[PDB]
């Protein structure tokens, strides 16, 4: 959920640039650059919430998410499986978009309805934080983005 | 004692070593030096890591390096400036709880640079640092007469090539004392207890000696843990002594290569003097518990007027004082080494400020910059070149 180039607030340090995501017995590490004091902070991704570091989708990201939601088979299943895995809100968006459009027509498989329902869960959770709202008006925004 | 004549290239090479320059590094590679380490680099390694109370947080230092000199030699002379380059180090703070690693480049002061001539320019004036002759590594026993008890006193110094001193002595009160790293005198049994000796094993080994029995009884320490804390109180007065940190401090003082080195010749001389490892190749040049105990026994037997001794598993050696006017017991300290030792003193004070700031600062707010105060390092250099 942390993307290179994103800016996150690091308590006691200020604005931190996500500069890289390393692999360092071996787990996933955030490499953060605070220009203030030219400080480099490496922290295990799983621990980011404990230290008070969150990657919240900015206005750049909200656009992209809405742009991708509006944009115009074992293969397709595994691709979408992979997108939900990556925790990338843009990927989740693609999954929501493609599955929802299919659900309007041919209908989904039970397995796919589950995949879609989960992707929405993830997506509105992310939208809710991005528009600083709390999981009731986020989905409403999603539907209207979807219906239109 | 300062030298009366200096070899120029020995001194200039010593400075290149100190600053870990490219030409020192390439020359080391050409000789096939194993693990070449520069002077400043060695000091940073010596003190890393600085840990807090509980072994949760740590601060480490690495990669000393310089930007270009602030100004040309001629300009420094013509404008009465100091010919110097800014020193930087990389400092890394680690929170073991969260796994946070916080690192930054830290300015450590402007560092006076040596010239082509082997000189320094200090506020416009060109100066030459003179090397010193100091006692070479080894173990040295001596005998004196008190003023005024009429008593015959004995003492011994263990001197390394690099690292803290260890001294023992029998005073006019007929007690055996230890001075660790030139600190306050302690009953020698405190050091034995700190190394893990029970009262029983101290008596098995040293019970023959009247002054050792008297030292043990008047030693107010009960057990290994109390002994460790008391050494900590002597070495770091005013700081909260804990068990684990006292163990680490004593261990690093003498028994690990990080901060202590007898060098090969000092290691040889200690073996020879005390009768330890006689047919054996020298591998390590740290001190051992065995050395400490044999040194005490030597001093004690010397005091009772004995003339030979044999430590457990060792060979018989004569028990006597060292003439210590002999050459071979003097050693050259180069300019790079003198500056290196001065930096080390400055850093040690900086090191203490770090531990003190670790007790009060919010761990979540701590960075190397909030912990590091370079003033004693800057002051140490200013004093040296004044």
UniProtKB/Swiss-Prot annotation, chain A:
Family of the protein in this entry: Belongs to the CarD family.
SMART domains the UniProt entry points to: CarD_TRCF (SM01058)
Function: Controls rRNA transcription by binding to the RNA polymerase (RNAP). Required for replication and persistence during infection of mice.
Biological processes per GO annotation: rRNA transcription
Gene3D superfamilies: 2.40.10.170, CarD-like, C-terminal domain
Keywords in alphabetical order: Virulence
The protein's name in its UniProt record: RNA polymerase-binding transcription factor CarD
One Pfam family of this chain: CarD_C
Species of origin: Mycobacterium tuberculosis (strain CDC 1551 / Oshkosh)
Covalent S-S links between cysteines: none
PANTHER family: RNA POLYMERASE-BINDING TRANSCRIPTION FACTOR CARD, TRANSCRIPTION FACTOR YDEB-RELATED
Coiled coil segments of this chain: none
Position of the signal peptide: none
Swiss-Prot record, chain B:
Keywords annotated in UniProt: Antibiotic resistance, DNA-directed RNA polymerase, Nucleotidyltransferase, Transcription, Transferase
GO molecular function, one term: DNA binding
Tree of life domain: Bacteria
Alphabetical GO biological process terms: DNA-templated transcription; response to antibiotic
GO CC, alphabetical: DNA-directed RNA polymerase complex
Coiled coil stretches, renumbered: none
The UniProt record lists the keyword Repeat: no
Function as written in the Swiss-Prot or TrEMBL entry: DNA-dependent RNA polymerase catalyzes the transcription of DNA into RNA using the four ribonucleoside triphosphates as substrates.
Quaternary organization: The RNAP catalytic core consists of 2 alpha, 1 beta, 1 beta' and 1 omega subunit. When a sigma factor is associated with the core the holoenzyme is formed, which can initiate transcription.
Family: Belongs to the RNA polymerase beta chain family.
Record-given protein name: DNA-directed RNA polymerase subunit beta
Native species: Mycobacterium tuberculosis (strain CDC 1551 / Oshkosh)
Lineage summary: Bacteria, Bacillati, Actinomycetota, Actinomycetes, Mycobacteriales
Primary gene name: rpoB
């Amino acid at each position: 959920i942390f993307k290179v180039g994103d800016t996150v607030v690091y308590p006691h340090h200020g604005a931190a640039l996500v500069e890289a995501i390393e692999t360092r017995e071996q787990k996933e590490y955030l490499v953060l650059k605070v220009a203030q004091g030219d400080l480099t902070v490496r922290v295990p991704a799983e621990n980011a919430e404990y230290v008070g570091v969150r990657d919240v989708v900015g206005q750049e990201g909200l656009d992209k998410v809405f742009q991708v939601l509006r944009a115009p088979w074992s293969r397709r299943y595994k691709a979408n499986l992979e997108k939900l895995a990556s925790g990338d809100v843009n990927k989740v968006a693609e999954v929501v978009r493609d599955l929802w459009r299919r659900d309007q027509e041919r209908g989904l498989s039970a397995g796919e309805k589950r995949m879609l329902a989960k992707a929405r869960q993830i997506l509105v959770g992310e939208l809710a934080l991005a528009e600083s709202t709390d999981d009731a008006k986020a989905e409403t925004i999603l539907d209207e983005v979807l219906a239109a | 004692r300062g030298s009366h004549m200096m070899l120029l290239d020995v001194q200039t090479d010593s400075f290149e070593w100190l600053i870990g320059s490219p030409r020192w590094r390439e020359s080391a590679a050409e000789r096939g030096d194993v693990n070449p380490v520069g002077g400043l680099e060695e000091v940073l390694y010596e003190l890393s890591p600085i840990e807090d109370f509980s072994g949760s947080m740590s601060l480490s230092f690495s990669d000393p390096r310089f930007d270009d000199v602030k100004a040309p030699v001629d300009e420094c002379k013509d404008k009465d400036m100091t010919y110097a380059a800014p020193l930087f180090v990389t400092a890394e703070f680690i929170n073991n709880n969260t796994g946070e690693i916080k690192s930054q480049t830290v300015f450590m002061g402007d560092f006076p640079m040596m010239t082509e001539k082997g000189t320094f320019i200090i506020n416009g004036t060109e100066r030459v640092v003179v090397s010193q002759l100091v006692r070479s590594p080894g173990v040295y026993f001596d005998e004196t007469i008190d003023k005024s008890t009429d008593k015959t006193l004995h003492s011994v110094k263990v001197i390394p090539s690099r690292g803290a001193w260890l001294e023992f002595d029998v005073d006019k009160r007929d007690t055996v004392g230890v001075r660790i790293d030139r600190k306050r005198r302690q009953p020698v049994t405190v050091l034995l207890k700190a190394l893990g000796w029970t009262s029983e094993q101290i008596v098995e080994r040293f019970g023959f000696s009247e002054i050792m029995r008297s030292t043990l009884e008047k030693d107010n320490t009960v057990g290994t843990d109390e002994a460790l804390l008391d050494i900590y109180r002597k070495l770091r007065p005013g700081e909260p002594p804990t068990k684990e940190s006292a163990q680490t401090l004593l261990e690093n003082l003498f028994f690990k290569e990080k901060r202590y080195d007898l060098a090969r010749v000092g290691r040889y001389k200690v073996n020879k003097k005390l009768g330890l490892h006689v047919g054996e190749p020298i591998t390590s040049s740290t001190l051992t518990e065995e050395d400490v105990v044999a040194t005490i026994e030597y001093l004690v037997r010397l005091h009772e007027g004995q003339t030979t001794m044999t430590v457990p598993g060792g060979v018989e050696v004569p028990v006597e004082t060292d003439d210590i006017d002999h050459f071979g017991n003097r050693r050259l300290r180069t300019v790079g080494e003198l500056i290196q030792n001065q930096i080390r003193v400055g850093m040690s004070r900086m090191e203490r400020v770090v531990r003190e700031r670790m007790t009060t600062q919010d761990v979540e707010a701590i960075t190397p910059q909030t912990l590091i105060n370079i003033r004693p390092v800057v002051a140490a250099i200013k004093e040296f070149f004044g």
